[PDB]
Design a protein around this ligand. Sequence first.
Ligand SMILES: CC[N+](C)(C)CCCS(=O)(=O)[O-]
Ligand SMILES: CC[N+](C)(C)CCCS(=O)(=O)[O-]
Lengths: 278, 290
Amino acid sequence: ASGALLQQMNLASQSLNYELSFISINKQGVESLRYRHARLDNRPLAQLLQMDGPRREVVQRGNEISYFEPFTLNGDYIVDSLPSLIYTDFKRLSPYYDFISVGRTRIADRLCEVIRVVARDGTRYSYIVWMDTESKLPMRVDLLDRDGETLEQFRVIAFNVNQDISSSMQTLAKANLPPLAKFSWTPTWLPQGFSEVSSSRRPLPTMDNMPIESRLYSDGLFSFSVNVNRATPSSTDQMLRTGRRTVSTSVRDNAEITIVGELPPQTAKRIAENIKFG
Amino acid sequence: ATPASGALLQQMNLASQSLNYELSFISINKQGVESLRYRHARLDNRPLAQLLQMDGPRREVVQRGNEISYFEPGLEPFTLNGDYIVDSLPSLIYTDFKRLSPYYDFISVGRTRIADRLCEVIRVVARDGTRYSYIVWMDTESKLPMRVDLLDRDGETLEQFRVIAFNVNQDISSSMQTLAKANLPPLLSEKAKFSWTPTWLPQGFSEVSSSRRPLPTMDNMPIESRLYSDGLFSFSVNVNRATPSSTDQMLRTGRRTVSTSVRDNAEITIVGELPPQTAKRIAENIKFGA
Ligand SMILES: CC[N+](C)(C)CCCS(=O)(=O)[O-]
Ligand SMILES: CC[N+](C)(C)CCCS(=O)(=O)[O-]
């Protein structure tokens, strides 16, 4: 029951005290991170630290996420390294994802269940998760191409679980932190599972205050934005894929459509070229 | 009010040999990113160590005094004599920097954060431009190595050692305490002078041992070996009787260079952590009948 195992991983991630020492591998290279999580006063407490170079820090205290290099904002979880699929509602996903068992294997000196998370309609990237058989915490996570090429890799190098909370986190618990629309277009085609999260109109940083209209879509796991703005003679069709960011611009009619998010290029384009106007 | 680079390096060496610690590190090279764990302690005025491969089959290597035991996937384990576990730590760590200094330069490149620690950054370069070099990041408190790169003469990195998490001075683990008293696999099993010597060696190198060994051939063809080291890098000069099938060739993989040259009736093959150019220069400077 992979579905159940994945739900358990999510739950372990949200409710245990733990420290993960892990590396993030992608085209940029091998980055060294530390994540600490705890529960204190029935409230989440977390720290993501960049280990090498300048001291980039991010902390979570309840729904306050404070960033450091010096602000804070609201959110239910730290984003985009610590594998956002760890905070995924897998019950929400099951109708349109397959969870596939690929057996057990040693990662980080632990026996792990290995599970593929694939969207049924062949439309998105996929994950494969190695989870600790005891703690249920994620030991390794690969983000994969539709062609099986790896875009991003999360690998735990050392960890501990169930220990009492660091002086750091014990401090952070009390320490004071920094604290801080209707469109004329819709997408006619979205991959099975996606639904709108928010809409916004934003003035572009240009001499004309030219609006850009954005819809944020998510399927509980992957997310992207559809951005529309009035076309100019300098607007062009183009595709850029780096890692998990695809930027797909297409010009249709008098509009500049740009899709930004975790999507195979093909899918982004298919969305772009299915927006109905008027 | 900060020490010369050589004093720092000596400190790191000392820290490595006398502290109890655990390094969780990755070694990066053309193979990929491999995840290792190294534990070191001293118990009964004796070294105690464990190198564990963290992913896949459970490859383990352990040190107890001067015995090194090798544990493997579905294999009978064995023990050898050795002063330290190899392919663990970069060899750089066991180095005697007092010894190296007449022929190496130790160059400060400042301080930087590795593994949430302020580190001194130091290049270790051989003065005669003859070898690969290292750059070390060393924890400013513990003195332990936090990162180590081995570099081409062109600055390309051949191998990288990076600690991801570590602890120091913490109690010797009950796993390690078990090892001290554990049953180790039984220890598993020539002294001569030759007619040839290398006339050119990089500044610093000196002979470690000599041996004559019968090759695994129908004729019991001897092969004569001199092991050289400079305290950091090491190589062997191997001579054997040339055959019609003996050819000049160079193979460099990572930090193994195999350089064969045939001069006169001899097949000379140099094996070790040396730039190809240097290996060849040694091979083609052996005299015979000295
Ligand atoms: C086939 C070549 N590219 C564009 C990289 C496609 C890779 C597969 S996909 O759809 O997941 O991006
Ligand atoms: C000079 C070109 N090659 C041999 C490829 C670069 C290696 C330089 S080396 O071996 O001395 O570091």
